Amino acid sequence: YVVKETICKRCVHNMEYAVKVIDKPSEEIEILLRYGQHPNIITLKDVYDLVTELMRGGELLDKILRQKFFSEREASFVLHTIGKTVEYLHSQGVVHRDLKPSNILYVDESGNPECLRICDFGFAKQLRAENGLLMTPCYTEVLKRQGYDEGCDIWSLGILLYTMLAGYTPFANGPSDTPEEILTRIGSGKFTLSGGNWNTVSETAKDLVSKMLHVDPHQRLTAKQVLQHPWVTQKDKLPQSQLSHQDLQLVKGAMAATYSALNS
Numbered sequence: 362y363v364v365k366e367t368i369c370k371r372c373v374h375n376m377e378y379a380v381k382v383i384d385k386p387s388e389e390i391e392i393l394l395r396y397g398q399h400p401n402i403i404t405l406k407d408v409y410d411l412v413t414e415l416m417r418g419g420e421l422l423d424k425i426l427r428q429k430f431f432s433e434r435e436a437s438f439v440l441h442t443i444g445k446t447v448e449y450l451h452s453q454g455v456v457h458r459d460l461k462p463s464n465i466l467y468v469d470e471s472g473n474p475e476c477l478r479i480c481d482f483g484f485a486k487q488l489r490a491e492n493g494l495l496m497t498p499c500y501t502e503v504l505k506r507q508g509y510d511e512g513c514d515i516w517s518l519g520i521l522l523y524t525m526l527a528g529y530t531p532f533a534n535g536p537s538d539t540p541e542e543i544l545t546r547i548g549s550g551k552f553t554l555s556g557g558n559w560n561t562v563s564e565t566a567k568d569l570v571s572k573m574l575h576v577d578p579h580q581r582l583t584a585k586q587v588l589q590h591p592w593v594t595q596k597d598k599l600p601q602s603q604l605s606h607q608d609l610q611l612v613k614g615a616m617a618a619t620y621s622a623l624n625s
């Protein structure tokens with residue numbers, strides 16, 4: 362490898378790759394080695410004492426809230442792509458726990474949904490027995506946290522969906538928002554789905570967001586249940602008019618602030 366400039370940093374063989382250098386680690390290497398093969402999970406090329414595929418298309422919001430023509434039809438292909446990958450991960454007993462939009466990148470500058478990749482597994486954990494051998498939800502405190510952590514991966518896709526639809530985040534108005542104001546909004550379980558831009562959004566889209574962001578995490582939807590919703594299944598039925606959106610930096614800043622509030 363011929364180590365080049367930082368974006369963690371790019372390299373060569375003769376082809377270009379990315380390298381994520383970490384300070385003193387094992388759970389991420391294991392998830393990437395057993396599941397990296399998935400088209401929409403970043404492929405691990407090598408591990409030394411980690412080499413991955415170089416993402417050349419930037420983060421999701423950067424494309425969808427800028428150049429790319431973006432309507433409900435396009436938003437549906439994004440949720441499906443990511444929803445299917447998350448459904449696959451949950452079936453294998455893998456929870457992500459950092460499924461914020463900045464961890465969803467494009468391999469190329471095409472904006473094609475197939476090019477989407479979930480890129481960071483540093484917060485990800487595998488459901489283990491105790492010995493511990495790997496366990497899936499299929500073979501039934503550890504199981505209760507997994508259920509809670511699955512619902513947190515769905516909630517995160519819920520805020521992604523909301524952002525894609527509204528062109529703003531459900532619980533933060535900008536980077537200036539404090540944990541106090543964001544945490545109060547989350548805890549209330551209330552969010553706008555009416556007025557202005559929301560008035561031209563489909564009733565099916567509003568139905569899914571409500572079900573994904575539901576106050577009661579028990580009345581919330583599973584990854585399998587999201588993908589079976591008409592908004593995802595019935596693509597022909599969706600509006601194809603450009604979705605309105607706020608300034609990109611403002612939206613990105615609102616997301617960073619939201620996750621900063623949650624991680625605290």
Ligand code: NA
Pocket residue numbers: 397398399400401402403404
């Ligand atoms: Na892959």
